[PDB]
């Protein structure tokens, strides 16, 4: 699209409509973009000394990108609630994007006095990496997505990436991608950039919780017909004499019943409690946390494989890195106290996946014989096994929406671990930069790189609309399901509202599983 | 009750705002809400036209009805006019019932 200077390049679309089966969440926000790295690509690396587990090598670019991989960039409390309360599941189908009403300003810091003014002509160029030839950054839970609250103006993030490294230094194989080596489209004012995408058949996120659970799944009333090993030894006057007898598992017997499927896999996490007291006093934050390691650098295992966060009656506990944790609007960056964060809870799964903090089961160790007692041992890490079945990490309104499946020789069940939809070809990276403006050059020629540009930034609005599909409920469940509600009682502030000084804020994390489906 | 026409779906609310103008941002990224905008306001004209219907009189009333008139006698200022310093002003409230219909 194209037009004039006194012509709005696009209108403001920010609705949300439900169609019974679909529902489209349109949404627009105003943004701003500075000139990063003063227009140059800069090489960047870990700090020489820095622990090995923390080295790196890569580049930062003068390019800034766009991102809305956060559910709340599309759903509004209320809306989300609608969804989350009457749908067995849902998934994204297609999207449409558009930047417009772009405007380029140029600040002038003459002595003690700045003065911003329109640089009409100068441009901002955009380009979408629709061929995925660029290090996909999104999906890395970074923060600089869209504001949950419309009215909020925002700054565009700067693109940076990482290649290979042998400590703080580069290794040859590492590649250096240059963003100008693409065909950016250049916008001036009166210019807009639209583009549209279509998702790929993915599974509806399961937005329901299970009423039955693996173990308790058969019918009480009837005993099976298969037998199991009831007792081993037997009374012989005073002493026992080994004599194995078997029984037919019934209701009273349950624990012993024969089955057909196994809980999901696991990778044991340390348990910490919301109650300061209980927790051993010391620094096992890193030392005790569950991790894995590549090329000799141990990394953390955050968002551990999807597994319930606490047994019955222990909402007080949680994994050291088995859950998602968001900050309460305002919460500072580092070492903030428990009271400043919102920890997610995944009890809803208990029913199928193991509890993060407790071992999977316990396999037998030795082979018993008359002169040898029967061994056994608990298992803290069980990789996928036939017959296992499980549930993936719920979603949360202010959580990630999707993530790119890495291009590898092999993947195994790609639901992104941080939760979300695992996409092979996700929404392409959208980039934006401000074509430089060489400030006054010298009369006599010089072949040096230009270094003195006009100080200036850009701004303008952006809009994103997405169509989601739904799987409606359908249970013959007689008694009421659970629903997500807002507290009745009076409060000094409404949830998901602007305070007295107009600061919007999300009180709690809102999950997705409320409706109840049987297993 | 304050008088007027009671409408089920009255003339829709019309709103207007000035899309903000982020004044000069810093070179290094920050995910905070933007708070420094360009100081500016808008202006321009607006127009409203409305079509009203009427029910004309029709009484066999012989003697004159009452009508609303403006005072004959001289005055320092005309009613519904700008004073000496150009300040328009409505002297009195003007009703609507003057014509006389039987009950």
């Amino acid at each position, epitope marked *: 699209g194209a037009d004039g200077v006194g012509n709005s390049s696009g209108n403001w679309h920010c609705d949300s409509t439900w169609m019974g089966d679909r529902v489209i969440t349109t949404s627009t926000r105003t943004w701003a973009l500075p000139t990063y790295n003063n227009h140059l690509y800069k090489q960047i690396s870990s700090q020489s000394g820095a622990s090995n587990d923390n080295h790196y090598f890569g580049y930062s670019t003068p390019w800034g990108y766009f991102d809305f991989n956060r559910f709340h960039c599309h759903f509004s409390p209320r809306d989300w609630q609608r969804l989350i309360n009457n749908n067995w599941g849902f998934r994204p189908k297609r999207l449409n994007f558009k930047l417009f009403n772009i405007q380029v300003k140029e600040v002038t810091q003459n002595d003690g006095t700045t003065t911003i003014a329109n640089n009409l002509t100068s441009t901002v160029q955009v380009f979408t990496d629709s061929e995925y030839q660029l290090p996909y950054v999104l999906g890395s839970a970074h923060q600089g997505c869209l504001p949950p609250f419309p009215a909020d103006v925002f700054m565009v993030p700067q693109y940076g990436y990482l290649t290979l490294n042998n400590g703080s230094q580069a290794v040859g194989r590492s590649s250096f991608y240059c963003l100008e080596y693409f065909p950016s489209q250049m916008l001036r004012t009166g210019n807009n950039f639209t583009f549209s995408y279509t998702f790929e058949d993915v599974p509806f996120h399961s937005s329901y919780a299970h009423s039955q659970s693996l173990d308790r799944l058969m019918n009480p009333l009837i005993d099976q017909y298969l037998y199991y090993l009831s007792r081993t030894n037997t009374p012989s006057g005073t002493t026992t004499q080994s004599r194995l007898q078997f029984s037919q598992a019934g209701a009273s017997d349950i624990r012993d019943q024969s089955r057909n499927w196994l809980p999901g896999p696991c990778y044991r996490q340390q348990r910490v409690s919301k109650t300061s007291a209980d927790n051993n006093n010391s620094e096992y934050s890193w030392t005790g946390a569950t991790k894995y390691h590549l090329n000799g650098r141990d990394s953390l295992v955050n968002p551990g494989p999807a597994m319930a966060s606490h047994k019955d009656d222990e909402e007080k506990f949680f994994p050291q890195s088995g859950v998602l944790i968001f900050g309460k609007q305002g919460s*500072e960056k580092t070492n903030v106290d428990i009271e400043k964060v919102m920890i997610t809870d995944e009890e809803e799964i208990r029913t199928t996946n193991p509890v993060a903090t407790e071992q999977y089961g316990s396999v037998s160790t030795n082979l018993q014989r008359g002169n040898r007692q029967a061994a056994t041992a608990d298992v803290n890490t069980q990789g996928v096994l036939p017959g296992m079945v499980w549930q993936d990490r719920d979603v949360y309104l202010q959580g990630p929406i999707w993530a790119k499946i890495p291009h590898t020789d092999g993947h195994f069940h790609p639901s992104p671990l941080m939760g979300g939809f695992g996409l092979k070809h996700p929404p392409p990276q959208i980039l934006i930069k401000n074509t430089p403006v060489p400030a006054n050059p010298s009369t006599t020629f010089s072949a040096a790189k230009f270094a003195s540009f006009i100080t200036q930034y850009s701004t303008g609005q952006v809009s994103v609309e997405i169509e989601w599909e739904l799987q409606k409920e359908n249970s013959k469940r007689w008694n009421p399901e659970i629903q997500y509600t807002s507290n009745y009682n009076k409060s*000094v502030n409404v949830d998901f509202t602007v305070d007295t000084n*107009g600061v919007y804020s999300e009180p709690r994390p809102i999950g997705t599983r409320y409706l109840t489906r049987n297993l | 009750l304050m008088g007027g026409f009671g409408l089920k779906h009255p003339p829709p609310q019309i709103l207007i705002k000035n899309t903000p103008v982020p004044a000069n941002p810093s070179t290094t990224f920050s995910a905070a809400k933007f708070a420094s905008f360009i100081t500016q306001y808008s202006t321009g004209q607006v127009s409203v036209e409305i079509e009203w219907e009427l029910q004309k009189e029709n009484s066999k009333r012989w003697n004159p009805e009452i009508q609303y008139t403006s005072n004959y006698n001289k005055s320092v200022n005309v009613d519904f006019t700008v004073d000496t310093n150009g300040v328009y002003s409505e002297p009195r409230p003007i009703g609507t019932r003057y014509l006389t219909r039987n009950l």
Partner: antibody, heavy 120, light 108 residues
């Protein structure tokens, strides 16, 4: 110049220690209305707003102080308290408690103030 | 944080004179500004709130005006009680911030 409200607490505190002050209000009830704030003045002159506690019991703190400040209340006693941990020499100042006519405006009633010096 | 700057750091004046103090904000406060008076060895007292509304019991001699960034406090005829330092305070957004203060020495 003039007001009502009274603060109490130790005049001296050792550095890494915690400062605890109490504000006793008379002629008004801590519940039912108004937010009660804490403000301090360094000996030079400036006033700095520490944070407040609402009638409902909700609190807001200055971001600078947030990590080491806690404000609580005892309705029975009609007193509200200030706790500042990890005190430093910079913390030396006169501490005031004040009421905030709330909703639209601010601090209607102030205390006498108590001087707290942080020294070894 | 919004920064408030107060004009004259100090003024000397006698009973009966008119004094004017200024306060300007780093950003538009929208008249959420209050003025306080503080005597030596004393705590502050609320003179005006909402930029122009006098607190109950405050004498008519005090008045405030302003909008946007700049506000002013005026005392028509100074009284002996008037000696004190005056501070402006913004309550547009947290954290609330105060001006540096203006010391009015009334007393010859």
């Amino acid at each position: 110049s003039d007001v009502q409200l009274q603060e109490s607490g130790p005049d001296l505190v050792k550095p890494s220690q915690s400062l605890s002050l109490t504000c006793t209000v008379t002629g008004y009830s801590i519940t039912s209305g108004y937010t009660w704030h804490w403000i301090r003045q360094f000996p030079g002159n400036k006033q700095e707003w520490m944070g407040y506690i609402h009638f409902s019991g909700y609190t807001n703190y200055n971001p600078s102080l947030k990590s080491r400040v806690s404000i609580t209340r005892d309705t029975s006693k009609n007193q509200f308290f200030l706790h500042l941990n990890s005190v430093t020499t910079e913390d030396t100042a006169t501490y005031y408690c004040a009421r905030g006519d709330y909703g639209y405006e601010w601090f209607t009633y102030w205390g006498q103030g108590t001087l707290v010096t942080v020294s070894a | 944080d919004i920064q408030m700057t107060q004009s004259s750091s100090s003024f000397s004046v006698s009973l009966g004179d008119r004094v004017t103090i200024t306060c300007k904000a780093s950003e538009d406060i929208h008249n959420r500004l209050a003025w306080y008076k503080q005597k030596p060895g004393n705590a502050p007292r609320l003179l005006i709130s909402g930029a122009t509304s006098l607190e109950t019991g405050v004498p008519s001699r005090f008045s405030g005006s302003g909008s946007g960034k700049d506000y002013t406090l005026s005392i028509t005829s100074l009284q002996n009680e008037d000696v004190a330092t005056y501070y402006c305070q913004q309550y547009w957004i947290g954290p609330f911030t105060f001006g540096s203060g203006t010391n009015l020495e009334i007393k010859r």
